[PDB]
Amino acid sequence: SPWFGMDIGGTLVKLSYFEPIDITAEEEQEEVESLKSIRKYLTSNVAYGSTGIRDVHLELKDLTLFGRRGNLHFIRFPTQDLPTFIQMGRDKTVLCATGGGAYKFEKDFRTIGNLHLHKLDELDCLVKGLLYIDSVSFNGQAECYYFANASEPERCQKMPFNLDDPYPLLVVNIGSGVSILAVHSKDNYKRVTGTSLGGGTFLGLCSLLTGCESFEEALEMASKGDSTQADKLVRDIYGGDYERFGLPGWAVASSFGNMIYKEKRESVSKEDLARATLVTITNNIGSVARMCAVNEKINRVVFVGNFLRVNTLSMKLLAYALDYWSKGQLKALFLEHEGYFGAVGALLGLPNF
Amino acid sequence: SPWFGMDIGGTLVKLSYFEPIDITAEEEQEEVESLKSIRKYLTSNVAYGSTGIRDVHLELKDLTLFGRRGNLHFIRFPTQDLPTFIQMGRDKTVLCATGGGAYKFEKDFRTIGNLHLHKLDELDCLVKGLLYIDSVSFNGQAECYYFANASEPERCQKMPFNLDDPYPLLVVNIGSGVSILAVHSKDNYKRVTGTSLGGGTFLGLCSLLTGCESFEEALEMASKGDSTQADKLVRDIYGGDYERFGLPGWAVASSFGNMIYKEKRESVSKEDLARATLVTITNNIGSVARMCAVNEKINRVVFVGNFLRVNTLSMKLLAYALDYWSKGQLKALFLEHEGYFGAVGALLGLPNF
Numbered sequence: 001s002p003w004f005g006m007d008i009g010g011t012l013v014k015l016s017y018f019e020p021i022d023i024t025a026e027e028e029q030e031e032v033e034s035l036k037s038i039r040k041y042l043t044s045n046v047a048y049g050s051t052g053i054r055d056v057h058l059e060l061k062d063l064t065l066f067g068r069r070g071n072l073h074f075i076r077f078p079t080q081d082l083p084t085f086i087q088m089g090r091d092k093t094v095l096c097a098t099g100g101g102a103y104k105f106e107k108d109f110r111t112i113g114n115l116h117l118h119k120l121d122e123l124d125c126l127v128k129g130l131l132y133i134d135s136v137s138f139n140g141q142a143e144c145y146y147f148a149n150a151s152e153p154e155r156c157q158k159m160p161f162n163l164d165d166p167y168p169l170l171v172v173n174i175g176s177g178v179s180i181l182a183v184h185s186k187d188n189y190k191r192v193t194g195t196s197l198g199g200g201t202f203l204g205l206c207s208l209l210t211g212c213e214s215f216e217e218a219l220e221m222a223s224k225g226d227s228t229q230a231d232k233l234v235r236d237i238y239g240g241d242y243e244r245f246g247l248p249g250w251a252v253a254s255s256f257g258n259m260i261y262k263e264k265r266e267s268v269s270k271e272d273l274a275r276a277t278l279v280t281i282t283n284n285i286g287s288v289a290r291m292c293a294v295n296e297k298i299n300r301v302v303f304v305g306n307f308l309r310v311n312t313l314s315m316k317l318l319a320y321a322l323d324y325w326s327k328g329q330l331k332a333l334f335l336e337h338e339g340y341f342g343a344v345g346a347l348l349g350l351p352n353f
Numbered sequence: 354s355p356w357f358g359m360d361i362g363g364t365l366v367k368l369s370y371f372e373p374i375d376i377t378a379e380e381e382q383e384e385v386e387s388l389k390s391i392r393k394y395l396t397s398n399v400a401y402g403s404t405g406i407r408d409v410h411l412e413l414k415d416l417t418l419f420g421r422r423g424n425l426h427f428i429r430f431p432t433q434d435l436p437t438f439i440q441m442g443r444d445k446t447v448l449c450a451t452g453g454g455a456y457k458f459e460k461d462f463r464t465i466g467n468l469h470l471h472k473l474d475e476l477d478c479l480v481k482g483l484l485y486i487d488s489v490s491f492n493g494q495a496e497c498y499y500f501a502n503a504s505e506p507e508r509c510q511k512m513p514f515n516l517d518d519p520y521p522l523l524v525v526n527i528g529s530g531v532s533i534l535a536v537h538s539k540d541n542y543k544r545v546t547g548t549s550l551g552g553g554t555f556l557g558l559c560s561l562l563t564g565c566e567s568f569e570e571a572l573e574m575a576s577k578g579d580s581t582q583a584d585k586l587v588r589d590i591y592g593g594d595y596e597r598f599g600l601p602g603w604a605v606a607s608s609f610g611n612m613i614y615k616e617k618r619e620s621v622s623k624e625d626l627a628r629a630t631l632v633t634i635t636n637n638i639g640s641v642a643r644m645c646a647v648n649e650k651i652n653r654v655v656f657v658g659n660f661l662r663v664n665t666l667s668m669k670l671l672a673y674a675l676d677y678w679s680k681g682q683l684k685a686l687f688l689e690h691e692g693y694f695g696a697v698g699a700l701l702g703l704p705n706f
């Protein structure tokens with residue numbers, strides 16, 4: 001069988017696929033046409049159908065996995081289109097799968113004759129996949145990075161971060177919702193808590209407020225907006241800073257709080273609303289992460305999920321906010337393969353079956 | 354001068370007024386007409402102008418304060434209408450004032466000839482006012498209450514709570530934004546953190562999403578709605594409970610997360626959106642309160658502000674959520690005079706001037 005790892009989330013399906021590159025002459029013979037058609041279809045196309053995408057820049061080249069050399073590919077498509085994926089499977093096998101959809105769609109995967117579905121623990125998969133990718137490196141580059149001098153924009157820059165001893169680690173998984181994990185050892189990790197104000201809140205509220213019809217359009221709108229047109233700031237309430245409690249005048253006192261005034265609702269732009277939605281969600285995630293880090297006594301906070309893909313505004317807001325409000329005690333960390341760790345961890349469960 | 358305590362917030366001005374009821378024959382003579390007109394106007398009307406309200410049910414009767422017997426009155430009006438309040442002052446005095454508006458509008462208060470403005474610490478005022486009101490009781494009834502058996506609706510009921518030894522106490526002030534205070538002693542208290550997702554977020558987002566034009570209309574809409582039409586639940590992602598992490602199927606996994614689907618945005622009602630906004634804001638406040646309580650090692654969490662006025666949906670959601678997610682370790686507490694403690698504490702600063 002082809003070696004596949006799948007994470008079926010509430011919004012996106014993530015697939016990791018290992019393409020062997022050490023196929024012998026005899027191995028290529030014993031290959032069946034449909035397997036050849038699958039490998040060729042996946043490696044010769046970057047878009048699949050109308051909604052599938054291969055993230056080619058993330059590919060790990062010449063990886064040694066399970067005694068074989070190959071390339072590791074990273075592919076995503078909307079969970080809404082999983083019926084098409086399954087129907088293509090039926091028209092053409094151990095599947096290690098995680099995420100909520102591994103349970104919800106179990107019976108659907110079993111409509112593919114003789115398919116064995118192994119549902120794997122979401123937590124085990126995320127941690128194992130994250131530790132594995134960092135261990136193998138991103139084609140010799142660091143998998144993990146931070147934003148250096150996150151407080152000063154003329155200096156702020158992406159820089160590599162070493163995770164050779166990753167413990168302890170607070171993992172903030174920003175998907176549809178948010179899960180916060182504490183990782184103390186390779187064997188000792190737990191889900192601390194979560195928040196329902198996650199990437200699905202950004203996308204859902206932005207769509208209601210602006211009519212945007214994609215994540216990417218929502219980000220494009222937010223990049224042009226001014227969130228202070230919708231938010232009420234400390235200086236709007238006090239006239240300036242509130243130094244008694246260390247609150248700068250620019251801090252948001254009430255998200256969307258200026259929208260209680262009808263004349264302000266009538267003048268705000270869609271772009272302003274999109275940016276306020278992004279700022280509201282991102283700041284709340286940062287604050288929840290900081291509170292959990294203080295309670296777990298962990299100072300490294302790594303953010304994963306796909307809320308942060310092609311989203312440098314939110315990444316830089318997290319980096320600045322965690323450093324500023326922690327007085328420099330906490331560091332925001334990011335990972336190049338942030339959306340795919342569950343899918344990789346699922347793939348890594350293959351030998352136990 | 355008349356004895357007044359004012360808390361000028363980002364949204365509402367709260368005024369506490371002590372009406373003496375032990376006026377002697379000679380004292381009534383030495384009273385000037387404008388003071389008589391002020392007292393009569395305040396005590397013979399329940400609405401003031403178009404936006405001022407006296408909360409008559411909160412009145413403390415026959416209180417002894419500063420060596421005099423009187424009634425303590427509680428009055429509120431929008432900060433947007435503070436110009437009218439000041440203009441009525443000029444057309445007719447030590448003013449102890451707190452809140453951000455005591456700083457922002459300092460010069461405006463000083464347009465009233467010879468008026469002395471004493472800006473008082475918001476934290477000192479909230480704590481002193483809260484401790485004072487609980488100490489004097491609510492006309493012999495408890496000032497503080499909780500919801501007994503908050504998990505079972507056929508049993509859940511408001512019940513009194515004793516605060517004779519109030520320390521330690523976590524105070525969650527839900528105004529435009531949210532401030533979280535830790536009160537360890539009458540002299541030892543601090544602002545722990547805050548969140549900008551507060552009552553102004555509820556009101557602002559609800560107005561944008563539904564067109565409601567008052568707090569009360571927003572609550573009326575929310576009472577008729579179904580938040581699960583907009584929110585994505587754990588059972589929507591997993592097909593059921595996620596017992597591995599203790600998440601019931603009914604828990605919200607992504608607030609507004611079903612609004613990423615255009616057909617669902619086209620079918621959701623305004624009432625559904627209002628309820629989802631209330632649930633989103635209230636749950637996030639509860640979760641932040643729980644995290645702070647765990648970090649401060651405090652198990653009594655008292656909620657104040659005016660986000661909870663005439664808002665039993667949010668109060669019962671906080672009571673159920675704090676008890677459920679803390680496995681019964683934390684108790685949600687509420688106070689009858691929750692919006693007015695800053696104004697009372699300001700009034701109590703009068704002797705130091």
Ligand SMILES: Nc1ncnc2c1ncn2[C@@H]1O[C@H](COP(=O)(O)OP(=O)(O)NP(=O)(O)O)[C@@H](O)[C@H]1O
Binds near residue numbers: 011176200201
């Ligand atoms: N192409 C996209 N389509 C939709 N959302 C996207 C897309 N790209 C990035 N996102 C963002 O990424 C979030 C989902 O990230 P993801 O990590 O895949 O979560 P999920 O696994 O599908 N949901 P969950 O079950 O809670 O883990 C969305 O809510 C968006 O904010």
Ligand SMILES: Nc1ncnc2c1ncn2[C@@H]1O[C@H](COP(=O)(O)OP(=O)(O)NP(=O)(O)O)[C@@H](O)[C@H]1O
Binds near residue numbers: 362662
């Ligand atoms: N009549 C009302 N008008 C507006 N908002 C109301 C009203 N009644 C209750 N509220 C709610 O109460 C919240 C404000 O409560 P409040 O405690 O008075 O805060 P504030 O002091 O004005 N703002 P802040 O400066 O952050 O403390 C509003 O955001 C509403 O959600």
Ligand SMILES: CCS(=O)(=O)Nc1ccc(CC(=O)N2CCN(c3ccc(Cl)nn3)CC2)c(F)c1
Binds near residue numbers: 178194195587590
């Ligand atoms: C990974 C499983 S998921 O895929 O279904 N995603 C997912 C993401 C976030 C959540 C939210 C989550 O963790 N809550 C637990 C903590 N809460 C509260 C609420 C009030 C209080 Cl007072 N205290 N605590 C809120 C809910 C969730 F339930 C599922």
Ligand SMILES: CCS(=O)(=O)Nc1ccc(CC(=O)N2CCN(c3ccc(Cl)nn3)CC2)c(F)c1
Binds near residue numbers: 233251254546
């Ligand atoms: C009482 C003064 S007010 O009247 O102006 N109201 C008021 C209410 C809430 C707030 C918000 C507040 O406290 N923040 C401090 C903590 N934050 C974060 C953000 C990201 C991270 Cl990573 N960590 N922490 C957010 C802001 C405020 F600034 C003022």
Ligand SMILES: [Mg+2]
Binds near residue numbers: 010099175176
């Ligand atoms: Mg996920």
Ligand SMILES: [Mg+2]
Binds near residue numbers: 362452528529
């Ligand atoms: Mg206030």
